Amino acid sequence: DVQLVESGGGLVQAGGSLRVSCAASGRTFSSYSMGWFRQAPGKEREFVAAISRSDNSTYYADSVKGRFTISRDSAKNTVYLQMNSLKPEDTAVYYCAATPYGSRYYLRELREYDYWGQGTQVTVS
Template identity: 35%
Template sequence: GLELSQPSVMVVKPGESPSFTCKVSGYSVSDSSISFATGWVRKPARKAMEWISNIWDDDASSNSVSLQGQSLQPEDTAVYYCVRNPPQ
């Protein structure tokens, strides 16, 4: 089956630029098919789920994707999820 694993908790201070990594199993992150694309969403408290526009990179050797946060601020507080895009 498919599995996407990421750290359960990460605490970031304002102004920091952390990297979030998601390990994928069950498909290849380097697969060019859109149905296997992996991306990121976040869920702020009391708000709707949001797609993340930050740049993310895939690493075929570890079959993982990383999201680079850039100078995060208190308003960026949210639960972040890596997700597999649904088949088109």
């Protein structure tokens, strides 16, 4: 078992910036890669960004590339998703996930993520 806590969601206008965080427990950061998934209104959930624990490599969806940045703090056991140049299309429920995998061939796959968090509704207007 692994547990993830989420905080930082808000309402912002077009072209604005925000920052969502995820709380991690124990040594999960060492054994698990951290991923972030957003669910658009009336649509299925999709991958946004991932952080590899093995090579500490970052992976992004091409829709959020250049605007979103994923970060890792080993001491704080916290992950930060810095969202810039926010568009109304970015309005979604942002979800936390941990995967035992570490390569690019597995980090984009929602099905490969063992643990999840509740998430926070982020709105852009």
